[PDB]
């Protein structure tokens, strides 16, 4: 019985591969040779957010592109005012091993989680003005790797137990469960319409899931190692994935295969964070070699290098208006980079 | 300066002084990571160190030795795969790796786990406090003679007791020979790589003695000293 099922699965995989080969008439590089190259991009640091007692593990931008939330593994969650470098909030955490943080689109809630397997959501607009633990979500059997707000009442959270879950804030229960990954899920990226989300795991594959339904739609296996980060394209029809194989890959939700591969001989370290700008032409990826690389999404060349961190880059984010790029690192310093004409 | 901006600056200064106090508290405390297999007596050590004091994901135990606070973190509900979350412990003071010395069949698995921890890219700068737990069980197994280490490790046949060994006065020579063979097996892997940037501290633990935490304290002291010696390039 098992042998027949395995043979049928292999036949289905071969048919999918044949269909992908048939629909791949040409590559992105072949038709992107006629576009003007971006050139050597140069960026400079504008702000240096310091004050964290330990390594910064994740950060997230607000919808106003002014307040940013960062999590440190010393047990602190700091909300900074980017423009004036002031610390708006400093929430102590019960668990000091936070690995991710999320800022609500309305800004009234901030979520965090980590090795404690608990998703802690805190208010920012309390009657007394003091922040406190609004809610705690439990049910994951693995470390909480990423979390993202959809609204003020529902949150999508990915855990190290190869499972994602859509939770309801009011009831504190898993409204929806997404399973199918064999490796630990490391990151998730919400689509602009929030109806679908892509999740990457350590099994060198990424999966697309429907928020409202709860089943996997598309699976991608271009990478050869664990996928550490994933970010949706601004149009919502594609995404980029970074892995430990020192190679970024661009996947399209319609072509159902890798379109562009970004790699270099001089780059051999893993990739930790990936993010697109507003236009999607530039892909910023953080690496373990203490610097970040900005690649051209169409030309697949090292458009720019940002070397201003003492330790490995752990997180990267781009504002909604795309005015500046925030990069965290294990050296407890959050660097804000911007371009100049 | 605007009134709203002035209020923001004042609250930022208040948060800064709160963070300064938090940093003063944080520097005094030392964080340790507890690792070991299921057969290892991690739970007994945690219970002893909690009672004596001198879904869940992770467990934290706070104990004070000589007015120094240590927070030991033990892995709770997590999957078998550990290559990812272990990177969170790249800046801990020490890693207490507890090994069941009486488990011959799974001893190779413990050796492989220790080798992986020692050779991890992000754990290269973290020392390991090795505890060879369950010494009484190992002594009883050696005295029984039903199971021989030579079958699992042929090189134990030609192994000899080190001249620097300091066994207990009323200890059987075979027991101390086997325990030092296990210690040397761990130390060969430890010295195989590292280049002196981190060190291993093997200890023999009975899972019930109160001195273990004290031992950890001593080890921590040494690490701190060596850390300073690494700052002045004296080692």
């Amino acid at each position, epitope marked *: 019985e098992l042998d027949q099922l395995r043979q049928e699965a292999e036949q289905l995989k071969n048919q999918i591969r044949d269909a992908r080969k048939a629909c791949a008439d040409a590559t992105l590089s072949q038709i992107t040779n006629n576009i003007d190259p971006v050139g050597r991009i140069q960026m400079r640091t504008r702000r240096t957010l310091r004050g964290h007692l330990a390594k910064i593990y994740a950060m997230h931008w607000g919808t106003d592109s002014r307040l940013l939330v960062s999590a440190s593994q010393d047990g602190k969650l700091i909300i900074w005012d980017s423009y004036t470098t002031n610390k708006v909030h400093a929430i102590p955490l019960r668990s000091s091993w936070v690995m991710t943080c999320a800022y609500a689109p309305s800004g009234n809630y901030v979520a965090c989680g980590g090795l404690d397997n608990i998703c802690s959501i805190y208010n920012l607009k309390t009657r007394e003005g003091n922040v406190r633990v609004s809610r705690e979500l439990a049910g994951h059997t693995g470390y909480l790797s990423c979390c993202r707000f959809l609204d003020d009442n529902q949150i999508v959270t990915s855990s190290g137990d190869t499972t994602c879950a859509l939770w309801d804030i009011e009831t504190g229960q898993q409204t929806t469960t997404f399973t199918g990954h064999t490796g630990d899920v490391m990151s998730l990226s919400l689509a602009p319409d929030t109806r679908l989300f892509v999740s990457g795991a350590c099994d060198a594959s990424a999966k697309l899931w429907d928020v409202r339904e709860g089943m996997c739609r598309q699976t991608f296996t271009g990478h050869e190692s664990d996928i550490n980060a994933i970010c949706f394209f601004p149009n919502g029809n594609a995404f980029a994935t970074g892995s430990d194989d020192a190679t970024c890959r661009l996947f399209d939700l319609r072509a159902d295969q890798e379109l562009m591969t970004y790699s270099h001989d001089n780059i051999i370290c893993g990739i930790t964070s990936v993010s697109f700008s507003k236009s999607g032409r530039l892909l910023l990826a953080g690496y373990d070699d203490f610097n970040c690389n900005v690649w051209d999404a169409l030309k697949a060349d090292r458009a720019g290098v940002l070397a201003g961190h003492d330790n490995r880059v752990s997180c990267l984010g781009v504002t909604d208006d795309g005015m500046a790029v925030a990069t965290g690192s294990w050296d407890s310093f959050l660097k804000i980079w911007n371009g100049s004409s | 300066l605007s009134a709203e901006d002035k209020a923001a600056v004042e609250r930022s200064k208040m948060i800064e002084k709160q963070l300064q106090k938090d940093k003063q508290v944080y520097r005094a405390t030392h964080r340790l990571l507890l690792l070991g297999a299921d057969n290892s007596g991690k739970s007994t050590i945690v219970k002893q160190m909690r009672i004596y004091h001198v879904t869940s994901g992770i467990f934290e135990t706070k104990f004070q030795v000589d007015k120094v606070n240590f927070h030991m973190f033990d892995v709770g509900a997590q999957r078998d795969e550990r290559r990812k979350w272990i990177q969170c412990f790249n800046d801990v003071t020490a890693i207490i790796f507890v090994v069941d010395s009486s488990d011959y069949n799974r001893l190779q698995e413990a050796l492989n786990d220790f080798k992986s*921890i020692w050779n991890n890219r992000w754990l290269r700068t973290i020392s390991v406090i090795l505890f060879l737990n369950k010494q009484d069980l190992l002594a009883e197994k050696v005295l029984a003679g039903k199971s021989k280490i030579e079958d699992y490790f042929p090189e134990f046949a030609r192994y000899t007791t080190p001249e620097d060994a300091t066994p207990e006065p009323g200890e059987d020579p075979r027991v101390t020979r086997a325990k030092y063979f296990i210690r040397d097996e761990f130390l060969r892997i430890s010295t195989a790589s590292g280049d002196g940037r981190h060190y291993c501290y093997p200890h023999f633990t009975c899972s019930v003695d109160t001195e273990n935490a004290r031992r950890i304290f001593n080890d921590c002291r040494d690490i701190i000293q060596r850390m300073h010696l690494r700052q002045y390039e004296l080692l």
Partner: nanobody
Amino acid sequence: QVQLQESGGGLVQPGGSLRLSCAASGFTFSNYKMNWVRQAPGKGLEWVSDISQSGASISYTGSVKGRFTISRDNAKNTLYLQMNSLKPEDTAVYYCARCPAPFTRDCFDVTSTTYAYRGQGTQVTVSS
């Protein structure tokens, strides 16, 4: 997609010789360390032997040291495990495991129960 295909196994008389072959595809064979992991009936996964990218460092476990030979062919991307003087206790399902990250020496969790980067394995039964 990363996949490993194993061949070689079946009933073998005690004291004989056997060869296990592993074919690798979907990744650069030369940039990853290779390991062999066996699962005996009624027991869990255990590490057997490993060989690095260039083959300079080759290690075996205590139970198979001096008995098994592990080699790799980067041109053919083929992993060979020659076993001689087999024992009845050596019957198990054998799988090939790949290092999770390139240019990495420590195989952190190649022996996990649900490790993705491993093949289906082959049964090797030593019976008389």
